[PDB]
Amino acid sequence: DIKELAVETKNFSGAELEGLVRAAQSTAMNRHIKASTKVEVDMEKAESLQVTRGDFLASLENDIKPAFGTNQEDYASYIMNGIIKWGDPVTRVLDDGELLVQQTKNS
Amino acid sequence: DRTPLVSVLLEGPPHSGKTALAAKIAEESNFPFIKICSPDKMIGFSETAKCQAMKKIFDDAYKSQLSCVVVDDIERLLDYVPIGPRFSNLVLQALLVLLKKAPPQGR
Ligand SMILES: Nc1ncnc2c1ncn2[C@@H]1O[C@H](COP(=O)(O)OP(=O)(O)OP(=O)(O)O)[C@@H](O)[C@H]1O
């Protein structure tokens, strides 16, 4: 899905956006060409080569990283063991924060 | 795995054998990366130099899988002396901050 990918990618230069595509093509291509002792294509039988979203996700996760920086690392590092509900104060605090967010949103 | 970071303080009167016991317990871990810092190898440095050295020592530990580090004679790291009292705040903050930063993921 193109729109989903566009939503996922942010702070991406055009060169990054097209390198992402190149990397996805590269991994799909490698899928059907493999040999270690020698080199050999998949008997040219991979004429139905199709690129799946999984290739794009793997590339976006391991291949192409924006230079402008991101904020996933901080989120994952700060909320480590998640949030559980042991008492009302948690709900009260979350509600109050939401109220203040609404305040600043529409003041 | 819930607690990738663990700390511990050995305490006792002077001339007890703390340093040797720490070294032995560290040795019997069979870990890949082990390091033993100490005031003895930076004597006469200024505060900035000590902070740089502590930075460089800790940075290495972040580039392994599992590691153990030793900090002996803390009272010398920061120049404590009863009269006053007088000491270095910069090194103290370096230590306090560094003792609550978990390493990269899966380490
Ligand atoms: N069971 C033991 N416990 C402690 N030290 C021992 C023991 N057996 C032998 N030793 C010897 O005792 C000495 C330990 O002195 P060490 O300087 O390590 O102690 P410390 O209390 O950490 O000293 P410092 O106050 O100078 O930092 C070493 O010579 C060590 O070989």
Swiss-Prot record, chain A:
It comes from the Eukaryota. ATP binds at residues 81-86. It is found in: Cytoplasm. Belongs to the AAA ATPase family. Required for vesicle-mediated transport. Catalyzes the fusion of transport vesicles within the Golgi cisternae. Is also required for transport from the endoplasmic reticulum to the Golgi stack. Seems to function as a fusion protein required for the delivery of cargo proteins to all compartments of the Golgi stack independent of vesicle origin. Interaction with AMPAR subunit GRIA2 leads to influence GRIA2 membrane cycling. Homohexamer. Interacts with GABARAP and GABARAPL2. Interacts with GRIA2. Interacts with PLK2, leading to disrupt the interaction with GRIA2. Interacts with MUSK; may regulate MUSK endocytosis and activity. Interacts with CDK16. This is Vesicle-fusing ATPase. The gene is NSF. The chain holds residues 425 to 531 of 744 of the full protein.
